[PDB]
Design a protein around this ligand. Structure first.
Ligand code: 5WX
Length: 109
C-alpha cells in the first residue's frame, strides 16, 4: 500500500501541523484586503486549507511535493512580514515543529 502509506504519513503530519497553537496565521489564504502588496511580492501563495485540499485530491504523490508546499507557507510569511512580528515568530516555531515531524517520520535522510 505504498501510495496509502505516504498518504497516511502526510495526513498525520498535516493534521499535527494544523492543530499546533502557532498554525493559526496559516489556516486560510492571505486576503488581498488584509495584506497590501502581498500578491505583488509573493508569487506562489500557499496555506494549510489549500494543502488539505491538495492532499485529499491525491496531489502529494511524493514527499518532495508536500515539503515544497509547506516550506513555502513559512518562507512566504517570512519574506512579507517584519522579523519581530507575531506572524514571523509563528512561522519559525511551526517550521521547527515541521522539520522535527518530517525527521521523526523518516521523510528526509
Ligand atoms: C492572518 O494571515 C495573514 C494576514 C496578513 C498577512 C499575512 O502574512 N502571512 C500571513 N499568514 C498573513
Amino acid at each position: 500500500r505504498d501510495p496509502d502509506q505516504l498518504y497516511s504519513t502526510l495526513k498525520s503530519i498535516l493534521q499535527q501541523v494544523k492543530s499546533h497553537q502557532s498554525a493559526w496565521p496559516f489556516m486560510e489564504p492571505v486576503k488581498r484586503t488584509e495584506a497590501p502588496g502581498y500578491y505583488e511580492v509573493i508569487r506562489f501563495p500557499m496555506d494549510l486549507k489549500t494543502m488539505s485540499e491538495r492532499l485529499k485530491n491525491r496531489y502529494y504523490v511524493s514527499k518532495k511535493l508536500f515539503m515544497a508546499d509547506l516550506q513555502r507557507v513559512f518562507t512566504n510569511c517570512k519574506e512579507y512580514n517584519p522579523p519581530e512580528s507575531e506572524y514571523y515568530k509563528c512561522a519559525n516555531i511551526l517550521e521547527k515543529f515541521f522539520f522535527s515531524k518530517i525527521k521523526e517520520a523518516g521523510l528526509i535522510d
